[PDB]
Amino acid sequence: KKEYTGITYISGPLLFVENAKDLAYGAIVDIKDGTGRVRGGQVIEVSEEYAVIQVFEETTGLDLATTSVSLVEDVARLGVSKEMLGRRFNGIGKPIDGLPPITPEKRLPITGLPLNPVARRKPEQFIQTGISTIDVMNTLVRGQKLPIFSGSGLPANEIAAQIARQATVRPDLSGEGEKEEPFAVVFAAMGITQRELSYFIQEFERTGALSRSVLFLNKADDPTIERILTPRMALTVAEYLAFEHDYHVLVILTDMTNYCEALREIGAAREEIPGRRGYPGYMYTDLATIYERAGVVEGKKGSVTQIPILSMPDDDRTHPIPDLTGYITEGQIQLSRELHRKGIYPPIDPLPSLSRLMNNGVGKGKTREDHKQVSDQLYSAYANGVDIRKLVAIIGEDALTENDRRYLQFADAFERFFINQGQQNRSIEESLQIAWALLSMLPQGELKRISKDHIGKYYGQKLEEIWGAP
Amino acid sequence: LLKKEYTGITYISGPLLFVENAKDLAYGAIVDIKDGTGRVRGGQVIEVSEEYAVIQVFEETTGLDLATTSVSLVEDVARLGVSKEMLGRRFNGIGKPIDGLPPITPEKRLPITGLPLNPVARRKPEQFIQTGISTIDVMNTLVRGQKLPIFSGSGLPANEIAAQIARQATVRPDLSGEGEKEEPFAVVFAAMGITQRELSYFIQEFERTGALSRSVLFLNKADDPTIERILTPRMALTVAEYLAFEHDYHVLVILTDMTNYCEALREIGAAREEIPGRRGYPGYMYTDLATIYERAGVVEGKKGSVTQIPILSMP
Amino acid sequence: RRVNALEQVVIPGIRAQIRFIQQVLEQREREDTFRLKRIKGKIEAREAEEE
Amino acid sequence: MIQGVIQKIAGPAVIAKGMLGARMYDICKVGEEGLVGEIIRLDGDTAFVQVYEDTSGLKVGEPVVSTGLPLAVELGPGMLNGIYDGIQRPLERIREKTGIYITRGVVVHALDREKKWAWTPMVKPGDEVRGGMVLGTVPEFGFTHKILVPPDVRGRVKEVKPAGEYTVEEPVVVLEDGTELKMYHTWPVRRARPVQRKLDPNTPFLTGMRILDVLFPVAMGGTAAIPGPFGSGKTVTQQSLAKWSNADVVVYVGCGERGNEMTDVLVEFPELTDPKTGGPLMHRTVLIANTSNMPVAAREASIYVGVTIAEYFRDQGFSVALMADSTSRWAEALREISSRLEEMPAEEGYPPYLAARLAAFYERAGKVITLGGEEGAVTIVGAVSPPGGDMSEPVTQSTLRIVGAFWRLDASLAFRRHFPAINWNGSYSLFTSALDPWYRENVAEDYPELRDAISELLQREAGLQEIVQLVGPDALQDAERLVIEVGRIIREDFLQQNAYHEVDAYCSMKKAYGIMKMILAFYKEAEAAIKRGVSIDEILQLPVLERIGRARYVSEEEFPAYFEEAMKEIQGAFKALA
Amino acid sequence: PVQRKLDPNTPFLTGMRILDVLFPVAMGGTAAIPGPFGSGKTVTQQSLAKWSNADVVVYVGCGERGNEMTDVLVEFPELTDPKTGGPLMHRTVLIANTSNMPVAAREASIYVGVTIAEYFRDQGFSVALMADSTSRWAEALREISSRLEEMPAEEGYPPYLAARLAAFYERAGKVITLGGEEGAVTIVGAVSP
Amino acid sequence: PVQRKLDPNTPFLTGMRILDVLFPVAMGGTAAIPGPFGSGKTVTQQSLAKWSNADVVVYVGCGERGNEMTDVLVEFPELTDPKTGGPLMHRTVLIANTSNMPVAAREASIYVGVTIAEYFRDQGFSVALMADSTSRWAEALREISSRLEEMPAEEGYPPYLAARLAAFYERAGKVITLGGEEGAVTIVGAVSP
Numbered sequence A: 001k002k003e004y005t006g007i008t009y010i011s012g013p014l015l016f017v018e019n020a021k022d023l024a025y026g027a028i029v030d031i032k033d034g035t036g037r038v039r040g041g042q043v044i045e046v047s048e049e050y051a052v053i054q055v056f057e058e059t060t061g062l063d064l065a066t067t068s069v070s071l072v073e074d075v076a077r078l079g080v081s082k083e084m085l086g087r088r089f090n091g092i093g094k095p096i097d098g099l100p101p102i103t104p105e106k107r108l109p110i111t112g113l114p115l116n117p118v119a120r121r122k123p124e125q126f127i128q129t130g131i132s133t134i135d136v137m138n139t140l141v142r143g144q145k146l147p148i149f150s151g152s153g154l155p156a157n158e159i160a161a162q163i164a165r166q167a168t169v170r171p172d173l174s175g176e177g178e179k180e181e182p183f184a185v186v187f188a189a190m191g192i193t194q195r196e197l198s199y200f201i202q203e204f205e206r207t208g209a210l211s212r213s214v215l216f217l218n219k220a221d222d223p224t225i226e227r228i229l230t231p232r233m234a235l236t237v238a239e240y241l242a243f244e245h246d247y248h249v250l251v252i253l254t255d256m257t258n259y260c261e262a263l264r265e266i267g268a269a270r271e272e273i274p275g276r277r278g279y280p281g282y283m284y285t286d287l288a289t290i291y292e293r294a295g296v297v298e299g300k301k302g303s304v305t306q307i308p309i310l311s312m313p314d315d316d317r318t319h320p321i322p323d324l325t326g327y328i329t330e331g332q333i334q335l336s337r338e339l340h341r342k343g344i345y346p347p348i349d350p351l352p353s354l355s356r357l358m359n360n361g362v363g364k365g366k367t368r369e370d371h372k373q374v375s376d377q378l379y380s381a382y383a384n385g386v387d388i389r390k391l392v393a394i395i396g397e398d399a400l401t402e403n404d405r406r407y408l409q410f411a412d413a414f415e416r417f418f419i420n421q422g423q424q425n426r427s428i429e430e431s432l433q434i435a436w437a438l439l440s441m442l443p444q445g446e447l448k449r450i451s452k453d454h455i456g457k458y459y460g461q462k463l464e465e466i467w468g469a470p
Numbered sequence B: 001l002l003k004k005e006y007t008g009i010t011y012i013s014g015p016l017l018f019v020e021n022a023k024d025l026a027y028g029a030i031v032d033i034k035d036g037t038g039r040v041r042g043g044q045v046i047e048v049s050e051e052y053a054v055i056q057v058f059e060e061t062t063g064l065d066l067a068t069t070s071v072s073l074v075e076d077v078a079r080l081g082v083s084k085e086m087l088g089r090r091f092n093g094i095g096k097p098i099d100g101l102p103p104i105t106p107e108k109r110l111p112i113t114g115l116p117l118n119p120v121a122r123r124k125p126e127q128f129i130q131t132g133i134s135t136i137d138v139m140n141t142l143v144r145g146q147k148l149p150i151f152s153g154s155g156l157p158a159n160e161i162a163a164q165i166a167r168q169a170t171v172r173p174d175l176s177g178e179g180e181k182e183e184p185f186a187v188v189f190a191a192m193g194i195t196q197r198e199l200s201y202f203i204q205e206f207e208r209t210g211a212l213s214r215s216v217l218f219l220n221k222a223d224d225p226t227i228e229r230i231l232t233p234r235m236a237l238t239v240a241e242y243l244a245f246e247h248d249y250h251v252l253v254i255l256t257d258m259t260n261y262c263e264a265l266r267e268i269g270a271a272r273e274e275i276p277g278r279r280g281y282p283g284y285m286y287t288d289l290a291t292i293y294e295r296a297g298v299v300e301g302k303k304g305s306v307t308q309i310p311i312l313s314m315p
Numbered sequence C: 001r002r003v004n005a006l007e008q009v010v011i012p013g014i015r016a017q018i019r020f021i022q023q024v025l026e027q028r029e030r031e032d033t034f035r036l037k038r039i040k041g042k043i044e045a046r047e048a049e050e051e
Numbered sequence D: 001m002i003q004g005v006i007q008k009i010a011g012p013a014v015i016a017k018g019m020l021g022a023r024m025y026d027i028c029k030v031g032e033e034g035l036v037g038e039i040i041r042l043d044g045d046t047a048f049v050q051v052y053e054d055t056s057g058l059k060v061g062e063p064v065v066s067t068g069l070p071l072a073v074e075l076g077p078g079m080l081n082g083i084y085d086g087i088q089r090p091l092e093r094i095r096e097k098t099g100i101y102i103t104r105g106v107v108v109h110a111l112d113r114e115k116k117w118a119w120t121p122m123v124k125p126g127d128e129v130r131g132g133m134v135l136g137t138v139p140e141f142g143f144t145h146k147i148l149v150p151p152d153v154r155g156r157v158k159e160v161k162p163a164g165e166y167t168v169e170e171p172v173v174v175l176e177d178g179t180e181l182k183m184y185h186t187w188p189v190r191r192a193r194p195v196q197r198k199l200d201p202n203t204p205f206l207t208g209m210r211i212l213d214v215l216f217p218v219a220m221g222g223t224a225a226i227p228g229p230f231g232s233g234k235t236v237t238q239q240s241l242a243k244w245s246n247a248d249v250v251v252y253v254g255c256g257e258r259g260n261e262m263t264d265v266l267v268e269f270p271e272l273t274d275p276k277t278g279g280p281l282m283h284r285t286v287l288i289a290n291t292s293n294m295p296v297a298a299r300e301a302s303i304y305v306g307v308t309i310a311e312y313f314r315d316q317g318f319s320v321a322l323m324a325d326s327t328s329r330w331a332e333a334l335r336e337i338s339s340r341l342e343e344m345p346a347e348e349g350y351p352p353y354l355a356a357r358l359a360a361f362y363e364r365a366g367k368v369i370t371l372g373g374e375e376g377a378v379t380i381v382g383a384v385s386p387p388g389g390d391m392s393e394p395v396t397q398s399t400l401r402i403v404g405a406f407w408r409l410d411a412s413l414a415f416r417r418h419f420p421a422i423n424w425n426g427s428y429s430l431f432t433s434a435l436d437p438w439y440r441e442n443v444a445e446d447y448p449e450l451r452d453a454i455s456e457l458l459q460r461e462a463g464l465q466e467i468v469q470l471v472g473p474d475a476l477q478d479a480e481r482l483v484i485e486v487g488r489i490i491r492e493d494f495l496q497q498n499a500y501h502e503v504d505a506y507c508s509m510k511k512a513y514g515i516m517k518m519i520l521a522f523y524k525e526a527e528a529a530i531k532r533g534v535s536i537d538e539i540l541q542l543p544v545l546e547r548i549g550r551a552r553y554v555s556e557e558e559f560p561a562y563f564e565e566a567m568k569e570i571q572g573a574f575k576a577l578a
Numbered sequence E, F: 001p002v003q004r005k006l007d008p009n010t011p012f013l014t015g016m017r018i019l020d021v022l023f024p025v026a027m028g029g030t031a032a033i034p035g036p037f038g039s040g041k042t043v044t045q046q047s048l049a050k051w052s053n054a055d056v057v058v059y060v061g062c063g064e065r066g067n068e069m070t071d072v073l074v075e076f077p078e079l080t081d082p083k084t085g086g087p088l089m090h091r092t093v094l095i096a097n098t099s100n101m102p103v104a105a106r107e108a109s110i111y112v113g114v115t116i117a118e119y120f121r122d123q124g125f126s127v128a129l130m131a132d133s134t135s136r137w138a139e140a141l142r143e144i145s146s147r148l149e150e151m152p153a154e155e156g157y158p159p160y161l162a163a164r165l166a167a168f169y170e171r172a173g174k175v176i177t178l179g180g181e182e183g184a185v186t187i188v189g190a191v192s193p
């Protein structure tokens, strides 16, 4: 209604408007010029004589004579509803599928309120992602923040799409059988290109997985403030669904490096002094307000699980973005360039990968009871094999003992069969059966980490039973 | 004596505060700051101009305001009261006794910065000091008037070596042929950045043998304000120079840790806000260290001497 | 002999080179922070102070 | 107090005008909602405040009201069995009125204002009192909480309330000058509480871990640091110290923890029991919890609140153990705060005054004579997490300069599942000589000789590592093979300890002394049998080796009979040989 | 403006074995070739302009040597088009802004070249766009930003540098034109760190 | 001022085998001797003062120890001039500014020493000028530029540091004086990195 015409300075992404002491901090405004085109803006500084507004998109058509500014909303809010399942959004809530806009049941602030530490409870249930190297050895637990570390040319988008397409819960293995649990996936993409957008749309729409998913998609040429606001909308939707309708949700953030670079650009544009290596000094706090919104709450049936994805700038783990992420999250999953160049997909290397909350979600009463010892034995045997392989290159294959040859064959068969699963969908029972078939190559009694009952019950199955469909 | 107070405080931020009408405050003067609650702090004028004078605070600025705060002048040049009765006493590196004894009555008041020695007035060092250590006394013997540091490490026992050198140091006139008369020997022990356990160890070590009767101790702890760490070695050097060049004493000065002094200097230097040096240390650190080490030596036509043994741990 | 030479010679030299490079990069970062502070101080000196 | 209005908002920094008379580092209530902040710059009629919470939605012209006091903590009855944040807010009482979230601007009190306490006065009218003495007692769980006059208050007693049920707000003692003394008082967290005299520590801080209290002990009142890489075992060791220490009061501080890791301790602790009296464990502990998403000001001031509470409990004659988990994440909060102030960072990005703050935190510990004439002690154990596992980090080097113990953790032992993964070569302790008189009056007269023999046996094995790297252990001579096998026996039977076992989680002094005696007796008998001349293969076959191996898992009150049987069993097995 | 984007499914043949086999580039994709001086960026880009299967080639010399432009102006009219048979210069458009030319015109040349390439895309052609160096564009942006008294990014560049580079590279792709035809633009950029 | 400058063709005999044989210096040349602490710069410079064939020796103690100055003050009158037979101090001019003296006077000492050395050159003598440390002059310039709130170039030094060093070292050489005689000045400066 009220329009301010006291524009006095336009330069780059900033403009000053005088006699605007009635605007609240952080408000959203609309900028209108003489041609009728309307742009969006946000207030970043309020003073007694002028206010500073950061403008989305370019400022080509603006002039100091005809420009006017009007107020939209004091706080950036999103209208959420259960009908948002099966829809796509552009990162600020505008649909991009051509369907009519949704009617909101409630309007919520995109900024988050911290959870009370005395209100949370310990995670105790696992999620079957369909990948053996994650389900068996790096188990994902409902309420965990388990990031994925990737490189430059590694296929992280394919892994993200496969996980979002194959994720499910298994109530038939938990307790007595339990009851049906609703499941949803919230997908957020930041700074993606047109090729990745088309790939994500084609992957989601070709198998009916869109009917249980919400998409927030942000392009690379979009304004950076929308990239900043992209994950918060997704986390607001996830929190609403989980803690108001008992949904078990899964949140995937496609590229946090783009978010960090956008944060750096915004901080530089607002005239602030950077900290370590040119990044803002409050990046640890800003990243913590995103990761720590996941978990499970005592007295509620829903849960929020986060799988952040970030790319190391130069395959360096001492970079600030991977270093601060490990200070907050509960482990990591690392992709391998050596496995990728050998034709192995997915190229997950289990030697540096680690899941902290694995022990709570596995054992008796929730998945099979021999999980932990099998995973430990597999890890130890692979660790032996990767050293015997490089000893072979110097001393030759005939200079070793027979058990070193067995370990080398185990390592080769492991890389060929367990990790290299392709586009299959493996249950936890199938993965455990393949793991036990791989452990039959090793002699009986050489498995120190496994008790005798499980060895008696499970050892002896041939590997060639997978030859029907390896 | 009359006192003058300035109430024109206009700006407080960090360690600095601005006083408006302080035209008569000389550069480098020492002031004291009194707040509404009556607590008194200390400061020094680092810049005085026509519009305002800049005073940095020795400690934190908690509780200061722009109404009840007043600034008064103590002295133009920082001075210390010295006496011959200070042998056998312990101080906190600023001049306050910590042994519980009544305070000393000064005979003279000397500036702690001192003055540079005339190179013509100097003479060459020519006599040695017996330290009781074979590797030192034979191969790298200490000479009266020399400055010979000890490069140590994190896990190495530098404190025990310092205590042993302080206990066993003596001057032997029987090997010189100038008569076996007594040449007075004193030890000045300055310790900064020293924890409570090391303080107890040093006090017990000095008290057990009886070497405290010929020594003056300046002890600065880690929790003390960082300005006392800066001012600790200058007071000890002032006392040593006074004793040596006014009472014919052969003094020995031991500085326990120069690394803590450099850390305190780096902490203080952020107030001036200049371009830093090699590893964040101030670019004037060479001059600041030279103003300390170059106060030792011997003077032509005088009997006394000053000897320094700095100790530092290489990072 | 090869094991002893590798464990006593090459690794400390590489480590010292790494330390030197890290110190140089840290000094450059400190200098650019100082430059940014000075240019911000010059920015506030004109718009917020002049008539 | 001074009231002003908002002039400019630029994020977390708000400029308030009309605030003449306000003091530096005071607490202000910003806006209509009542967000808290600190005054960091005074300039003319305006003041610069820094709001802790989110400033979105604020408008220019809203009132600003100062409190006139710096950051302080309410010290009095009702702090035990309580959960607090970094700025002393009860999280349980917040949840009862708000829900599962923490809304901005919520107002609560650190001490409950509606609970009645039993009052028993000790002073009488006409007495002369000074700071630090005792005015009365209050029963709190298993302790008798003493009511102390504040340290800066002195005067003459005018009127004393009689015995009865009073809240903390009732003035129990009113002095002659009009000053009213209540059950509680406030103390700034950045000012050390004064005492009379500091003393040398002479009693060991029993931990329950064998290697910690045997090889590298810490006296009661000293300081220790435990650095290590990821997965080394810092958190498990810290909570084991929380569970099994012999301290009267335990204060646990967590700065910048993860949500699920904080939830683990917040859940497991109410289910545990006190080893001394058998009651609930939470009846003796005070918990300070800060995950990564409360603001950086509460995370930075978390360790000073905890050390202030520990100093308050020290002044009543107790012995308090303070554990700070992951001070490296407190250094990150300090670095962020310094970055928001543009303070020209030192090497590795940290502010130049980091060492000063670390010294100020660690130098508040020690055994002292309180102002009330009683003896108290505070022991501080701090955990450090280096970024890449290297100990050249400025935080680690700053912590190494002042602590009296160093429990370094190694990643090599963690890979081989050797727990606790404490590198005994790289560790040290400066308290052995001080506690040497205490060991020979409470454990055994020859305990230091046994400890030195064990250390010498461990040192002899380390000098033989270059031999076993070339040739196999079997190729060694029998004399060297004996020390190799006894070193393996020591490593797998004395240093190894399981924190999750029913009985191996706690080990006393006498049990470890008996284990060392058995090991040394076996070594002497094996050396004698080698001197007569037998094959080493027959010695390693002896079934008495099983008895030493299972000596870890025998319970506490069955150990003397087991030790008595094993002491003669070793001799009986060794005489029945060539 | 366009009508609809398309998925990339046809390779862009360059004539170099390693680029065509090991690291292929699609007809609507984008590629980057960074390296130090004397490593062969200009030779590779000129070979791409000579031997590719694109209908129209647009070469943008943002802040580089004029001898290379003279080389292109002289040698190209004597060469043969691979798919037409006429002179090679009849399918090539050159935009030249050398290093001794004014600095502020470096930004405009890139936009002019990409606009011409988009115009030739709307007629149903396949257009190959070569940028000689975007580092010169970044250096020009840094030079202009000094006169505005701004607070810059990491290495003195303006904070809006990443937005311009993103907006430049998003103009490529295989589209369906407003006239119903099908065209594509492929961009090969060179970086001089 | 001078009339002409000539090519140096006679050696400056330092009396040290390694300097005189392997790496000689001429009668109008310049030399630099860098090294860490405790390497032998001061001993080499004092040996050059004692044993060289120069007629007049000018020694500048820019920011060094005072004991090294008292050594020259005491021991030199006892020694003998190698080429005249008189006392060694009768041909030596000493300029001293120790490390605890004011910093701003370090530059003035260097300029005074070089001006005196040029004055003795115009009378036909051969002069050897020795600067104890040129790093302290750079430190003084750094401090003065820091007081002037100037913009440092590298490690806090002013950008005009090389100009001052070039102007100082260019005053040496063998010349034909305005009176018609021949004179020469040699400069041997020490650097403490």
Ligand SMILES: Nc1ncnc2c1ncn2[C@@H]1O[C@H](COP(=O)(O)OP(=O)(O)OP(=O)(O)O)[C@@H](O)[C@H]1O
Residues within 6 Å of the ligand: E035, E036, E037, E038, E039, E040, E041, E042, E043, E044, E192
């Ligand atoms: N494919 C090739 N075959 C043969 N010679 C080549 C090839 N590529 C490069 N060269 C040689 O290497 C030289 C590299 O010069 P060129 O102009 O390609 O450098 P540039 O990498 O573009 O450098 P600048 O960044 O300085 O512009 C060429 O002049 C040529 O001599």
Ligand SMILES: Nc1ncnc2c1ncn2[C@@H]1O[C@H](COP(=O)(O)OP(=O)(O)OP(=O)(O)O)[C@@H](O)[C@H]1O
Residues within 6 Å of the ligand: F035, F036, F037, F038, F039, F040, F041, F042, F043, F044, F192
């Ligand atoms: N030619 C030499 N013959 C004998 N001893 C020498 C010689 N050169 C140096 N030394 C020894 O080495 C020491 C080096 O001292 P000197 O004053 O020359 O060092 P410097 O390089 O000037 O160091 P600084 O930078 O610390 O002043 C001498 O005091 C002397 O003991």
Ligand SMILES: Nc1ncnc2c1ncn2[C@@H]1O[C@H](COP(=O)(O)OP(=O)(O)O)[C@@H](O)[C@H]1O
Residues within 6 Å of the ligand: D229, D230, D231, D232, D233, D234, D235, D236, D237, D419, D420, D497, D498, D499, D500
């Ligand atoms: N004394 C012990 N007994 C058994 N397991 C241990 C012991 N100490 C550590 N561990 C194992 O090592 C792991 C260490 O992780 P944790 O201590 O939580 O974090 P960090 O070691 O990185 O600080 C734990 O998961 C635990 O299972």
Ligand SMILES: [Mg+2]
Residues within 6 Å of the ligand: D234, D235
């Ligand atoms: Mg931990």
Ligand SMILES: [Mg+2]
Residues within 6 Å of the ligand: E041, E042, E043
């Ligand atoms: Mg080129």
Ligand SMILES: [Mg+2]
Residues within 6 Å of the ligand: F041, F042, F064
């Ligand atoms: Mg020298």
